[PDB]
Every structure is written in structure tokens, then in C-alpha cells.
Amino acid sequence: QSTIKAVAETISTGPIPGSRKVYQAGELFPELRVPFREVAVHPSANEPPVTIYDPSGPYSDPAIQIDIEKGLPRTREALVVARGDVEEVADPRQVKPPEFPGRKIYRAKPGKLVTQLEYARAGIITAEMEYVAIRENLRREQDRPCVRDGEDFGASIPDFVTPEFVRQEIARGRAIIPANINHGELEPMAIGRNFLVKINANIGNTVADEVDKLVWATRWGADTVMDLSTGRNIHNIRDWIIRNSSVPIGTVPIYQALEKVNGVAEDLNWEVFRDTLIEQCEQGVDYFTIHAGVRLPFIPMTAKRVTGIVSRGGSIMAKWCLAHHKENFLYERFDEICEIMRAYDVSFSLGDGLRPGSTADANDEAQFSELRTLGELTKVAWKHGVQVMIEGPGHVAMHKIKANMDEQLKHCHEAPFYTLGPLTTDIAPGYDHITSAIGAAMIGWFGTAMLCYVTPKEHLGLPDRDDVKTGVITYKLAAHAADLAKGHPGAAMWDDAISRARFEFRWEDQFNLGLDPETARKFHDE
Amino acid sequence: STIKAVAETISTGPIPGSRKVYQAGELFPELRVPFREVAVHPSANEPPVTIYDPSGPYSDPAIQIDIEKGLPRTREALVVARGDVEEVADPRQVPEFPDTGRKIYRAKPGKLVTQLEYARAGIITAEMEYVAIRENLRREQDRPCVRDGEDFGASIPDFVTPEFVRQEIARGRAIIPANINHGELEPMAIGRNFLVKINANIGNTVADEVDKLVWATRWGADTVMDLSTGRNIHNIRDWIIRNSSVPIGTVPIYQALEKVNGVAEDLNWEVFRDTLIEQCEQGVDYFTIHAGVRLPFIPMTAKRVTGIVSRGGSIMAKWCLAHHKENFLYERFDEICEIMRAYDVSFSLGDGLRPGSTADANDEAQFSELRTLGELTKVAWKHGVQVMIEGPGHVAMHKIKANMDEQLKHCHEAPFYTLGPLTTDIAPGYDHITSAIGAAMIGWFGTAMLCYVTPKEHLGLPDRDDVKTGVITYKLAAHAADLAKGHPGAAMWDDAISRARFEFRWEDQFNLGLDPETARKFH
Ligand SMILES: Cc1ncc(COP(=O)(O)O)c(N)n1
Numbered sequence A: 001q002s003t004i005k006a007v008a009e010t011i012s013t014g015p016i017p018g019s020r021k022v023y024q025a026g027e028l029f030p031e032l033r034v035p036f037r038e039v040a041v042h043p044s045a046n047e048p049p050v051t052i053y054d055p056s057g058p059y060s061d062p063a064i065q066i067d068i069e070k071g072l073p074r075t076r077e078a079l080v081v082a083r084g085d086v087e088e089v090a091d092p093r094q095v096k097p098p099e100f101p102g103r104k105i106y107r108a109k110p111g112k113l114v115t116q117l118e119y120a121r122a123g124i125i126t127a128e129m130e131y132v133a134i135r136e137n138l139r140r141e142q143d144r145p146c147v148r149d150g151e152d153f154g155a156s157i158p159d160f161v162t163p164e165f166v167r168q169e170i171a172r173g174r175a176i177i178p179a180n181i182n183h184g185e186l187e188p189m190a191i192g193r194n195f196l197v198k199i200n201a202n203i204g205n206t207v208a209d210e211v212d213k214l215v216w217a218t219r220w221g222a223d224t225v226m227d228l229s230t231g232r233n234i235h236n237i238r239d240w241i242i243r244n245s246s247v248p249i250g251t252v253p254i255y256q257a258l259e260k261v262n263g264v265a266e267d268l269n270w271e272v273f274r275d276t277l278i279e280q281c282e283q284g285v286d287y288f289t290i291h292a293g294v295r296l297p298f299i300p301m302t303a304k305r306v307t308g309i310v311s312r313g314g315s316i317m318a319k320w321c322l323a324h325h326k327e328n329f330l331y332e333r334f335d336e337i338c339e340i341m342r343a344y345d346v347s348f349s350l351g352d353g354l355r356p357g358s359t360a361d362a363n364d365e366a367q368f369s370e371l372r373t374l375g376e377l378t379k380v381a382w383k384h385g386v387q388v389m390i391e392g393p394g395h396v397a398m399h400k401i402k403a404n405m406d407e408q409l410k411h412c413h414e415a416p417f418y419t420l421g422p423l424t425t426d427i428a429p430g431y432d433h434i435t436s437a438i439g440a441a442m443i444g445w446f447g448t449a450m451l452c453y454v455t456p457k458e459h460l461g462l463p464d465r466d467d468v469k470t471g472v473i474t475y476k477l478a479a480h481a482a483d484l485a486k487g488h489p490g491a492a493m494w495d496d497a498i499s500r501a502r503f504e505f506r507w508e509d510q511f512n513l514g515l516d517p518e519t520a521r522k523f524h525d526e
Numbered sequence B: 001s002t003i004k005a006v007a008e009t010i011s012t013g014p015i016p017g018s019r020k021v022y023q024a025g026e027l028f029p030e031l032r033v034p035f036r037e038v039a040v041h042p043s044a045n046e047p048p049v050t051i052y053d054p055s056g057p058y059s060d061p062a063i064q065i066d067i068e069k070g071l072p073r074t075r076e077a078l079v080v081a082r083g084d085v086e087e088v089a090d091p092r093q094v095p096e097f098p099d100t101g102r103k104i105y106r107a108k109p110g111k112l113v114t115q116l117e118y119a120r121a122g123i124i125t126a127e128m129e130y131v132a133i134r135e136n137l138r139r140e141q142d143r144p145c146v147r148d149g150e151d152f153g154a155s156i157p158d159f160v161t162p163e164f165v166r167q168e169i170a171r172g173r174a175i176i177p178a179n180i181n182h183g184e185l186e187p188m189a190i191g192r193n194f195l196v197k198i199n200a201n202i203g204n205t206v207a208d209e210v211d212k213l214v215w216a217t218r219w220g221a222d223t224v225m226d227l228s229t230g231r232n233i234h235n236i237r238d239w240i241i242r243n244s245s246v247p248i249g250t251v252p253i254y255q256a257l258e259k260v261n262g263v264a265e266d267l268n269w270e271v272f273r274d275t276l277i278e279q280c281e282q283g284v285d286y287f288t289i290h291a292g293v294r295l296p297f298i299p300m301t302a303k304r305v306t307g308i309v310s311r312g313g314s315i316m317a318k319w320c321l322a323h324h325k326e327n328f329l330y331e332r333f334d335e336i337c338e339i340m341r342a343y344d345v346s347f348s349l350g351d352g353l354r355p356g357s358t359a360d361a362n363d364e365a366q367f368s369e370l371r372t373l374g375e376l377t378k379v380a381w382k383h384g385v386q387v388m389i390e391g392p393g394h395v396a397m398h399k400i401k402a403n404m405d406e407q408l409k410h411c412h413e414a415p416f417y418t419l420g421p422l423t424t425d426i427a428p429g430y431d432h433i434t435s436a437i438g439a440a441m442i443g444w445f446g447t448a449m450l451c452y453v454t455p456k457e458h459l460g461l462p463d464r465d466d467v468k469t470g471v472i473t474y475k476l477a478a479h480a481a482d483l484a485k486g487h488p489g490a491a492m493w494d495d496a497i498s499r500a501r502f503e504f505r506w507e508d509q510f511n512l513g514l515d516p517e518t519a520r521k522f523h
């Protein structure tokens, strides 16, 4: 009531300054409306508007009424039902505690295949695939010769993306579309090396503060969001997050499972984990970080490390294995995990439990032991038709970064790679968004598909909405620097547009074409 | 009055979490080479960490700051001791600084005076020892050493000796910017085989500028450039140089241009000549000079997206088109060297044609100028003048290595000095980040000094806080390159702070960071 009201007013909506929401309609599926934002420049410049990739969602479209009490419109629901492979859940799981308010809950019909991967391998172009192919082209036309200026290290970036190309990339496992059948609010996006580099923002510790940060983070360009909340009533909180999110939402299931056993790692068990998986599946979570690669024999390998085990979920599994002196039960039950996730088309984010937390620790036996295991677990996931991406480091000095990409590519069969940074030095607390931007831009260039961001508060405190924005802008510019260096066909038009504005002293156009127009404008001294 | 204000505004005293320490010279037993050291919790059982420190006497509690008298001229007696310079009989006289205690010097006819001349003559100078000590960070000399990095064919030693320094200088692969009239200077070296250095730009009043000087070096700026334009720039620079323990650079054309009332076309050799001599006697340590902007190169810039973005290169361009003559800096370059060599002023050969956008990177005009600079480098060396080369600019990541490769070849491995580069054009207000990605990579590849970029880049004038953000940003990029190169002293710092983090020694983690006060505030 009073809290749900203080959110509807505190969140930021309306057009992104200097631009406006535009849509492109689908052809294979004509009801699709794929969002972008467009920036028109001064008429005297005689230039066409600039199209920009836009994850902000309906929040920036003034024609749409926002009511978080009701959630966003479920514009994806009909398309999914339309395939006639899912059925309503008679009696879904309920979770007791602020409660969120007529959404039907779905599960694949017994014997039916429902994942984007399974559809692609069967030669089927789904609605999400066409939606994504449209999104990735930024409304470019094939009317002028396309000339490549970049180094993509053997990637297969096409001059123009087609729905058929998307299907091919997904079928081979080189790209994914995270899209739980129960996330009807979602605007589909793709993650893969042969597409734009995506970025991820982290949320999670009132409800308003977290919904706010979700809207704030996507407004500035976060392509996915992870709810990393821990403690009391995280499942209820996440309802508010997912129902009001137009971007894919990820989680670390073990956090919530651990809460069920009141924070005692040793008392974790398969039953509570499995139950957590189902609850989050019906809730609409799009991908799960699962640290199945933290195996028993790898744990002693971290004893000599300078900073040991820095992953939170990884440290929890470590505690469990050592307590029972048994193999990681997530690794042991890996097949039963696959059987659940595939019923709802949830994607794997195979966890970097043994990532380095200091540059001294980088590319060591423990980190690489896990990585090669992730490659093995990747193939098991494909067998069940589950979509997969691999998580990486971490803290890595610059000369060790290519080596990470080389290992991942070889050992994980070209599945998309998802990195946290990497931070290229340990000596600048307060500026870790910057130390990591260097590593992020480079590893993106080398072929990393998605970058998890870092705020200036890293290693020190909890990020406020200002820190979130800084992290997001930093990472959008690192992602784009990578696209540009790769010679991605859509990258140079943006830089060149802004440079022309600069050259002609078209100041306001310069601000409006920037990642953060209002800041540039404010800084500028007329 | 002005003295009053400045003394009040400036930041002095120990850098939080550390103390000033010195190592004495051995060849020259009177030398005192500064560092700052950070002690960790006694429970850690670790030696203190020695950190490179360009802050000068301002962070030394043994020294009482007096901006009216300037900094202690601790270098003067060493220079005089060599017996190669003499007082100038009739020095040039241009809020005026009380410069009564300082004698002005000039090489005696027929004597060696520059670091390069001394080095090629086989002489090890006081500045060379100074730098060698500074570059070792008080590490134990005799000790097995195993290097973990990739330096792309550099020649970085396990341990710097004054002799290695002399060799680097003599072959032209490093420099020590050290005007005989900058007696307050704490010597530093620039070269691929030393720690990556960074530069901070100041200049647009006095208190305003001196504060930025002290503030920038406080946070780690290795050199500073005075880029002031307009009236009274010479007299303002007095207040800066007399109070600077780091090398000071300028673009002399800015001052030459105020002599002719802002008319680029009214520039001539006579007014530039005079300017050079004024700055030589003042103590300026290096001159950015855009002698690479040649007449036939200018039309190459018409087809660019952002044209000519260098202020100095723009001024020269103007002059060349108006008189329809070759750049007189290029034409009279010999007489330029003859002036500089008399005071040991170093060349910073200008990047007049640097790319102002990623679309213009690595183009004909840019590399035409670069090849010209490599030719001028040889001429400068013939005159015994030290040389480093300026580069880009705006450059997409995939073109960055090619930039270094061209420079090493065409400029004979002289030190490279870049501005960024910015790796993308689309984030005005965040150009310290876009440029930091480029700066770290090109440093890794071999760039010796990196000119910083603030968040106000392209947009407005930096205030105190913007300068600090630029400096820390560039300190972190410089060190990330050292680390990646496998420089023998880099990992020790990262590992100390990593251990403090693992053991939850919060005070140590703060104090070992480039910015302790911010780290603690965020916590
Ligand atoms: C790529 C990635 N994955 C997950 C996490 C959080 O979870 P954890 O600290 O438990 O590994 C993270 N920060 N980055």
C-alpha cells in the first residue's frame, strides 16, 4: 500500500533524454514489436536518425501506463502458448513470507520439447529468434556496400543478421536466448559471440529500492539483470522484480536453498535445492548460475592461493563438500537438474566458483580444472537440450587474458562466455569499474559474449543508484569498444555520427548521441 | 597576499597511510631519492611496501613549505659541480614571483651539458644515479628473479643500475628531462624499459594553478604540462616551476602567439626564438613542438571526419596556409636544437596530426607526420638534444598495436608519449575510461608516458576533483601495463593488497590503495 505507492512514484520513466522509443514490426510473426531508441540530429546536418539498441522496456514509452502493482504487459505470452507445447500448471508451488498480486503458470506438456535449443535443432524459427534477428540489426538496410574494418579473431559475424542465422547459431550451441516460458513480460535478446556484446547488472542485498534499481539499470542499458538477494523472503521480493522486468532475469539458486536450511551450508541437500529450482522456474527466472564445477578434488588446489575462494556460491559448495567429504551434489545430480530446467526452458550459466580473486591467482590449476569440467557439463546439458553459457574470471593481468579466451573456446565448444571484468590490477579500490573496464573491453574483443559489470563500490560497500549507473555506462562503453574493434557492422555508424557532430560544433547532437546525454550537457561550459 | 591564499589552499603533509622515506646516493653521496612507504599490521609479519612517489617536499614533514621562496633548489649544486655551465650575464626579464635568490645558467661555449651528451661521452651523472635508485623501489639487488609477463621484446632488467640508465639514454631509448635552470627538480626517467610514467595538464589565477600542481603530483602525476593561453602566462609559470619538484613541459607556440596578439598568421621565427630562450632560462624541462605539420600534409586532413584537433597543430596549419610556406619549425629546426642544447631542454615532438576520431586513426596524414618526426629525431640527436615522440589520439583497439609498431620502427625506438588513446567516441563525460583502456594497452605494448584524460575531456575545464580522477585513472592504467609487462617491481604491490583483503586487514587494504581516503569513505 504505502510502500507499493512509494515505488510507483520513485522509479524513473519516460523517454531517454534526446531520443524516443521506436518499433520495428515482425514479418514471420507480424504481431511482434521490436524496440529501439532513435536520435534525430539537426536538420541542417542532413543526416538520418541514429538507431540505438534499447533494453529500457515500456518504461521509456509514454504511450504505455506503468503500474508495478500489476506488472508489465505479457506481450510474449500468446506467442509461447501459440506453439501449443505448454500447458497450465494445475497447482503451482506457493511460497510463504510484501506480497505481489492473474498470471497463468506454465510447464511443457509431457513428451513435448520446449527449449529454443530444441526448436533450432529441429529446424524451427521461433518468434524469439525473429525478434532477436530484428533487434540485432538496428534497422540497418542492405542498400550500401558493407566494408569491414576490424579484427574478430576468427568469429563469424555476418554483414546482416537473419532469423535463419540466429537459428543456426543456437542449434550449434554458439548462441543462446534466455527465455523462461513463464516470463511473459520479457523482450527477447540473444547472447553469443557473433552478436553485439551484452552486459549484466547485479541487484539485491525495501522492495521499492530493488524495483527502482532494476528500472534504473535497464534504462541506462543493462541487457540482463541478476537478483543476488540473500536472506529473508527473497522469493517474494523477486516476484516484484521479474513481473516488472522486460530484460532476462538470472539468479543463483543455492542462495535461496541455503535460506531454507537457515544458512547452514552443511545442511544443504538435493531436496531443498530441487524445490528451489521448481519455484524459480514457475516464477519465470531465465537462467540459473550453477556451480556444479566446484568438485571435491579441486578444492585443495585453492589452499595455496593468495585470496582463496571468492565466489559466494562456490564457497558454499566448498563448505558442503569438505563437511561431508563427498563429491559436489550439484555435479552428482547434474542430469536431474537438466530434466527440470528443460521443462521451462531455463538456461545454464555454469558458475565460476573457482575464479581468481587476485591477479596472482589467475589462470591457475584450480581455475582451469573447473573450466574444463564446465566443458564436459556443457555437453551433458546439450544432450537434454538445455541452453548453456559459461562463466569466467575474475582478476587477470592483461597478458593472461587471451589465454582465458583460448582455453574457454577449446574446452567448452564455443559456448558463450560470461565474464566478471576481469580486473587487470588489484591496487585501485574505489575505481574497480575502471580496472575491470580495461579487462572487459579486451576480453570482449577476444570473443566474450557477455560482461557482468562492476561498480566503484566493489570490495567496499553496497552500490547506490548512482554507482549502478556508473557501472552500467562504463560497461556499455566497454561492450561497444569491443564491438568496434571486432569490426561489427553496426558499430562505426554511431562513433562516426557523434564525431561529425563534434567536428561541426553541433553540441546538442553530441550530447544526445552520447551514452549519458544529461551528464555531458551539464559538464559542458557554453 | 597571493602568497597568503595559495599557502592556505594547497594540500600538504603525509599521504594518508604512508610516510616519506629516502635512499642516499653512493656515486653522489649527497643525493636523497624519495619514496613513500606503507607499513602493514604487525600481525601480518610483512615488510613495509615501498611506493614510487612524485609528490615532492609537500608530503615531507621534515620540510617547511614556503611558496614565496619556492621549493629547496637541491639540484643546483650538482649541476654547478659539473663545471659545464655559467651564469647568464643579462637574463631575460618578463602577480610577479620574487626570484632574487636564483642564478640563471647557460652552457659554457664548447662544453657538454645534456644528459644525452654526457651518456654518449660515457659519463654517469647525478641525475642518472638518482633515476636508477628511484626506479628500483628499494628492492634487494642480489636476488634470483623470475618474470611473469609479456613485454613484446623490451629490455627490462631484473635490477636497474646507473649504468643501464646511461646506456638507455645514449642509444636514445630513454630521456631525463632536466633543464639546468630547474634546480628544484627531483629527477625522473622516461622510457619503455622503465616504469610507465603519466602526465597531468594544468593551466587555463595563481592559487588556482599552484593548487592543481601540488594536487596532481600528490596523487601520482610524474610530469605536468602548463597549457595556459592568454595574458601573463609567463609570470604565472614562474609560480608553477619554482614550486614544482616534477618536470614541467610547455607548448612554446602558445606563448609566441600571445606576443602577436592571437594572430596565428602574425607568427614568425623572431618571436618564437625569443620565447624559447625565455622558457629555457625559466627552467622549462621540455618543449612540445609541432615541426611535423608540413605544408603538403595539410590537404591530407580535409578528407578526415574531424580534421585537425591539435591546438598547436591547428596554429601551425593556419600559418602555413596563410604564407604558403613550409612550417618554419621544420625549416629552422637546427637553430631550435642549438638553443635547447644550451640548457638541456628535451624535445617532445608534437602530434599535430593526431586522429580526433576513431574513423581517422592510422591515416595518411598521421603516419606522414610520424615518419617526419623520426627524421627530425636523428637531427635532434646529432645536436645532442634528448627526444621523445607524441602519438594518438582516438584509436580503435585493433589498431593500437600497429601504432606502436610504426613508431618503434620509424622513430628508432625513441620514447613514445600518447594521449589515451580513446578507444571509442560515444561516451563524452566518461573519456577517462574510454582512454584508460587504450592507455593501458599501448603502455603494455611499449609506450613510455601517458598523458591523462579527465571526465571533462571535450566538454569543459577540470576542477580539483576532475584532475584527481584523471590522475588515479592513469596511475591504474600505467601500473596495469607494468604488471602485464612483467616489470620486476609490480606484482609486489598487487599481492600485498590482495593478502590484506584475504586476511580482512581493512586498514591495510585502504592504505595500500591508490586512493586511501576514497576507499575508506566507501566503506
Ligand atoms: C559471472 C558471475 N556469476 C555470478 C556472480 C555472483 O555469484 P557468486 O559470487 O556466488 O559466484 C558474479 N558476480 N559474476
Ligand SMILES: Cc1ncc(COP(=O)(O)O)c(N)n1
Binding pocket: B201, B227, B251, B288, B309, B310, B311, B312, B313, B350, B351, B352, B390, B391, B417, B418, B419, B451
Ligand atoms: C601529449 C600532449 N601534447 C600536447 C597536448 C596539448 O597540445 P596540443 O592540443 O596543441 O597538441 C596534449 N593534450 N597532449
